[PDB]
Amino acid sequence: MQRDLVSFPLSPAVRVKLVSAGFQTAEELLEVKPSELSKEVGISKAEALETLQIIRREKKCTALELLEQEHTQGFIITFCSALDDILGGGVPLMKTTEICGAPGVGKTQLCMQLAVDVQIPECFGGVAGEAVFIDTEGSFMVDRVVDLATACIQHLQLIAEKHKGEEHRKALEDFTLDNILSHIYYFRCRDYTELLAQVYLLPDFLSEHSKVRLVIVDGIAFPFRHDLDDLSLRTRLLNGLAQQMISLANNHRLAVILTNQMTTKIDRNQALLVPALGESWGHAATIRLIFHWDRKQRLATLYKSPSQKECTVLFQIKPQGFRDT
Amino acid sequence: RVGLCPGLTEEMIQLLRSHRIKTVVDLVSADLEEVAQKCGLSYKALVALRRVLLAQFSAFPVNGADLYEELKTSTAILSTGIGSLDKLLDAGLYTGEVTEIVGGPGSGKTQVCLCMAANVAHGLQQNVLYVDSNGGLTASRLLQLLQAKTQDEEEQAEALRRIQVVHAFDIFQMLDVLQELRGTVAQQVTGSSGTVKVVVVDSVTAVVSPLLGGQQREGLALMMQLARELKTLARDLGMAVVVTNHITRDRDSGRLKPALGRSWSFVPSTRILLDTIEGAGASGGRRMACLAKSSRQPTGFQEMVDIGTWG
Amino acid sequence: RSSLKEIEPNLFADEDSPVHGDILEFHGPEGTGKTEMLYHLTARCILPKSEGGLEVEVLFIDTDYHFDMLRLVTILEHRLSQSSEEIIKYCLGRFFLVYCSSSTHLLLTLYSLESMFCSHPSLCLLILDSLSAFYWIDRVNGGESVNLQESTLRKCSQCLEKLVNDYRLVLFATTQTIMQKADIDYRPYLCKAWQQLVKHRMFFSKQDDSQSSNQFSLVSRCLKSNSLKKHFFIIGESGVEFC
Ligand SMILES: Nc1ncnc2c1ncn2[C@@H]1O[C@H](COP(=O)(O)OP(=O)(O)OP(=O)(O)O)[C@@H](O)[C@H]1O
Numbered sequence: 001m002q003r004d005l006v007s008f009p010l011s012p013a014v015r016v017k018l019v020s021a022g023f024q025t026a027e028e029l030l031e032v033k034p035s036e037l038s039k040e041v042g043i044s045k046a047e048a049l050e051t052l053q054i055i056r057r058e059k060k061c062t063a064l065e066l067l068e069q070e071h072t073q074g075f076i077i078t079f080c081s082a083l084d085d086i087l088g089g090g091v092p093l094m095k096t097t098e099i100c101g102a103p104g105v106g107k108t109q110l111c112m113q114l115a116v117d118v119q120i121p122e123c124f125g126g127v128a129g130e131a132v133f134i135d136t137e138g139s140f141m142v143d144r145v146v147d148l149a150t151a152c153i154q155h156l157q158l159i160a161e162k163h164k165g166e167e168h169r170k171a172l173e174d175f176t177l178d179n180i181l182s183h184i185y186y187f188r189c190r191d192y193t194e195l196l197a198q199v200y201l202l203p204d205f206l207s208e209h210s211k212v213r214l215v216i217v218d219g220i221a222f223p224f225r226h227d228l229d230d231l232s233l234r235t236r237l238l239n240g241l242a243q244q245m246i247s248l249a250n251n252h253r254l255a256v257i258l259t260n261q262m263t264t265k266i267d268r269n270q271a272l273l274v275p276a277l278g279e280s281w282g283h284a285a286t287i288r289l290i291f292h293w294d295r296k297q298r299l300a301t302l303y304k305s306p307s308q309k310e311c312t313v314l315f316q317i318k319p320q321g322f323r324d325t
Numbered sequence: 326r327v328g329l330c331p332g333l334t335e336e337m338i339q340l341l342r343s344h345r346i347k348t349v350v351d352l353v354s355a356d357l358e359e360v361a362q363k364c365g366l367s368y369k370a371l372v373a374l375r376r377v378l379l380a381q382f383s384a385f386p387v388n389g390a391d392l393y394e395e396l397k398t399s400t401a402i403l404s405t406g407i408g409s410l411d412k413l414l415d416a417g418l419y420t421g422e423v424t425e426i427v428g429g430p431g432s433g434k435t436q437v438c439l440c441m442a443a444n445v446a447h448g449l450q451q452n453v454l455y456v457d458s459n460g461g462l463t464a465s466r467l468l469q470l471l472q473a474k475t476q477d478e479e480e481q482a483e484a485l486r487r488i489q490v491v492h493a494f495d496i497f498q499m500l501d502v503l504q505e506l507r508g509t510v511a512q513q514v515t516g517s518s519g520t521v522k523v524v525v526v527d528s529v530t531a532v533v534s535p536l537l538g539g540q541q542r543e544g545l546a547l548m549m550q551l552a553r554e555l556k557t558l559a560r561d562l563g564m565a566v567v568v569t570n571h572i573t574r575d576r577d578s579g580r581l582k583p584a585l586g587r588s589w590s591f592v593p594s595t596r597i598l599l600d601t602i603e604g605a606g607a608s609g610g611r612r613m614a615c616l617a618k619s620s621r622q623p624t625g626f627q628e629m630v631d632i633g634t635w636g
Numbered sequence: 637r638s639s640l641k642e643i644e645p646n647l648f649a650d651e652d653s654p655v656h657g658d659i660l661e662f663h664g665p666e667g668t669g670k671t672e673m674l675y676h677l678t679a680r681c682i683l684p685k686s687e688g689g690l691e692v693e694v695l696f697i698d699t700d701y702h703f704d705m706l707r708l709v710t711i712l713e714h715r716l717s718q719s720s721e722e723i724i725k726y727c728l729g730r731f732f733l734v735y736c737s738s739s740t741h742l743l744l745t746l747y748s749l750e751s752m753f754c755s756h757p758s759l760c761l762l763i764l765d766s767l768s769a770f771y772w773i774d775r776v777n778g779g780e781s782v783n784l785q786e787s788t789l790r791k792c793s794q795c796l797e798k799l800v801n802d803y804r805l806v807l808f809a810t811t812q813t814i815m816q817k818a819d820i821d822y823r824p825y826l827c828k829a830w831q832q833l834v835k836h837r838m839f840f841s842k843q844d845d846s847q848s849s850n851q852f853s854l855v856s857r858c859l860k861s862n863s864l865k866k867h868f869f870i871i872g873e874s875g876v877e878f879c
């Protein structure tokens with residue numbers, strides 16, 4: 001029944017003033033006039049109003065409703081059947097997904113493919129949403145996106161022609177290149193301060209645009225791996241960013257995609273490739289995927305997942321984009 | 326203040342404020358004869374007032390045999406649904422204490438918590454509250470776990486309806502949720518079908534790590550407040566509290582230790598450490614269990630668990 | 637009426653005068669046998685005289701909510717030659733437990749316990765567990781002024797010293813190692829009055845090597861004579877056993 005003042009987000013000065021005055025429990029100030037509170041404590045009336053508003057600020061969902069919501073919300077297909085099968089159907093919403101790999105392995109291609117695929121009409125099993133792309137490396141080329149969108153449009157047209165329905169034609173009436181290109185929002189961040197500022201501004205942007213279903217941040221290692229010698233500050237910023245991203249994904253029913261880099265771990269006179277940014281960063285994401293070359297093929301490994309089992313599949317990059325075999 | 330306890334009037338309160346008496350401790354930490362000379366109040370009323378105030382605002386002791394008999398029929402042991410862990414934990418974990426599970430990424434803390442929640446919701450048919458702070462809870466995994474224990478659809482739905490899900494992504498939301506649960510349980514004493522028996526906090530580290538660092542001290546105070554809330558929930562209401570923590574290696578010694586620091590090291594009453602079996606022989610499911618801390622068993626015993634066989 | 641040597645001839649091999657008020661202190665990291673030592677002292681103190689006890693009552697104050705009645709009952713039944721429920725009930729009839737939730741709560745509990753202490757004459761031992769349970773919250777609540785970070789601890793220390801002086805009791809306290817210092821590791825951080833109230837000091841440690849554990853180190857340091865002693869002991873199903 002008793003709530004302590006320490007658990008409330010107050011400034012240290014007003015809190016220590018209240019403690020020194022003699023107030024210990026939250027309910028003790030619920031029956032004190034703000035003018036008398038200001039007189040006895042010594043704070044201003046604005047401070048009393050603010051603290052009274054703050055103190056009076058702090059539903060019931062079961063696993064069945066959560067399961068129903070999970071079934072209603074779809075997945076984002078990657079046009080790679082093996083990856084979808086090992087992921088459980090595709091990239092899940094309300095979860096944070098991370099992709100790691102060596103340079104030139106295909107992370108940006110996957111990001112572009114997901115940005116295109118998030119807009120597939122629900123008649124074909126898609127989600128019919130929009131995407132937000134945040135670029136911290138300048139590797140976003142519009143021509144590649146145009147190629148991927150054209151390939152996806154051709155694939156859907158062929159499927160609709162084979163099925164020979166009526167709903168499919170109506171759905172594909174508005175699935176043109178112009179709409180696909182116009183439903184992708186682009187941001188460019190040239191520093192980690194800019195990245196933090198954009199991530200801060202994200203919630204209002206998503207409130208304005210309620211049809212967004214995917215948020216991509218292509219590159220978090222680059223802004224944080226140069227000209228940053230205080231590693232404690234780096235870890236604090238990374239933890240805050242991860243918490244903000246998972247909160248955003250849960251609150252707005254999105255899918256968050258992050259791309260990382262690989263570094264070399266030197267032990268027993270042997271070199272192994274491991275994800276960068278330390279060990280504590282491994283707990284941040286919900287699903288972790290690792291891309292690597294074996295001999296000449298590209299492999300995708302489900303390194304971590306709370307719902308599926310570790311596996312390994314084969315993929316390749318075509319002129320049409322992310323594919324299989 | 327008026328209404329705090331009987332026998333207090335506003336005139337007396339203002340008169341006491343006139344002579345530098347403000348709070349209960351100030352009135353109690355005083356003298357009867359010394360104080361009753363600056364203003365000359367009623368002599369024998371002050372001692373009665375202090376006795377009343379001590380009666381309301383002080384805890385009382387209990388004889389050993391009484392609470393021995395009470396806890397004889399009150400403490401319960403809840404099986405985790407895994408035989409090896411039950412044997413390691415001596416047939417399960419007791420209510421009225423805090424349990425902690427530590428390990429690196431992919432150790433299996435979420436899997437253990439999910440198996441416990443499913444077993445308690447189905448095997449014992451009691452309510453479970455799940456607090457999630459990193460998005461690691463999925464209903465599909467719970468359904469898969471339940472499908473290995475029963476085949477009745479209505480039974481599965483009834484079991485699923487007994488698990489409550491709460492999302493908290495910062496420390497203040499978690500504290501508010503815990504205080505709301507405390508108030509709800511306090512108001513729900515008369516009822517017996519619906520009271521929560523097990524509380525799971527998916528990750529306490531995910532909400533305390535951003536507050537730790539620099540030369541400040543607010544993070545330590547907030548995490549101590551969280552620990553006090555968890556201890557109150559576990560002990561006062563006779564519940565079972567399970568939390569998970571991250572693992573860290575000491576730089577100066579190269580020894581694995583729990584995160585959140587030495588101050589947090591004192592909080593749990595029982596700790597379990599999970600690990601991977603040297604890579605080889607642990608390609609999946611095969612995990613290494615240990616008893617890092619306990620109060621009823623010697624420390625160091627090791628067992629074997631398999632996540633793949635639980636589903 | 638109370639003799640310190642009889643309480644523990646192993647650790648207290650030097651103190652033989654009839655105790656009429658003393659303050660002791662335990663210190664160390666987590667999982668080093670402080671609470672097991674407290675359990676052993678309580679078992680030695682509450683057992684019947686026929687089985688090798690002291691037949692006097694014990695008061696316990698719990699602050700970190702880490703008391704386990706099952707362990708105490710198991711230790712009592714293992715130390716007894718014959719196990720019977722009624723004898724366990726008689727033994728536990730002279731044991732009391734109190735819970736405190738905050739510094740003010742503990743202060744008022746101390747301000748209230750003298751009624752029982754005058755009521756019950758057979759009390760001879762007093763235990764306070766986790767005296768450093770509320771340090772960070774008090775420090776943060778006190779701002780930058782040191783005197784505002786120390787008032788409640790000052791009042792509690794004054795009340796404790798008054799009680800132990802008045803009623804001729806023995807106090808056992810426990811603190812936690814929270815901060816290091818830039819072979820004994822000890823960085824004092826408590827109230828000045830509490831620091832000056834201590835008479836004996838004991839440090840706890842655990843063997844780093846995993847020889848199935850079963851080895852704990854204790855360093856006894858008495859400020860009266862500056863005598864440093866090292867003790868070795870083991871903990872089993874029957875309690876603690878000195879090597
Ligand atoms: N259905 C399943 N069948 C087999 N193994 C599974 C299944 N679901 C999950 N796993 C295993 O669970 C492991 C991850 O466990 P879990 O999600 O409990 O980790 P964690 O310790 O909570 O991690 P984090 O610190 O990232 O939150 C995976 O490596 C995978 O092998």
Ligand SMILES: Nc1ncnc2c1ncn2[C@@H]1O[C@H](COP(=O)(O)OP(=O)(O)OP(=O)(O)O)[C@@H](O)[C@H]1O
Nearest residue numbers: 620621622623624666667668669670671672872873
């Ligand atoms: N039945 C038993 N047999 C052997 N050892 C036991 C038994 N029960 C408990 N222990 C030992 O007790 C130790 C913990 O002791 P204890 O609970 O007194 O710790 P502590 O030093 O008071 O720490 P903290 O105050 O942080 O809990 C464990 O390391 C464990 O090996």
Ligand SMILES: Nc1ncnc2c1ncn2[C@@H]1O[C@H](COP(=O)(O)OP(=O)(O)O)[C@@H](O)[C@H]1O
Nearest residue numbers: 101102103104105106107108109110317318319
């Ligand atoms: N238009 C295209 N047609 C065929 N293959 C391409 C085309 N564009 C890029 N690729 C291949 O896809 C890969 C892209 O990798 P990239 O997305 O840069 O990975 P990363 O961002 O991790 O370096 C390159 O190795 C390249 O060979």
Ligand SMILES: [Mg+2]
Nearest residue numbers: 107108137139
């Ligand atoms: Mg790239």
Ligand SMILES: [Mg+2]
Nearest residue numbers: 306434435461
């Ligand atoms: Mg997890």
Ligand SMILES: [Mg+2]
Nearest residue numbers: 667670671702
């Ligand atoms: Mg202990």
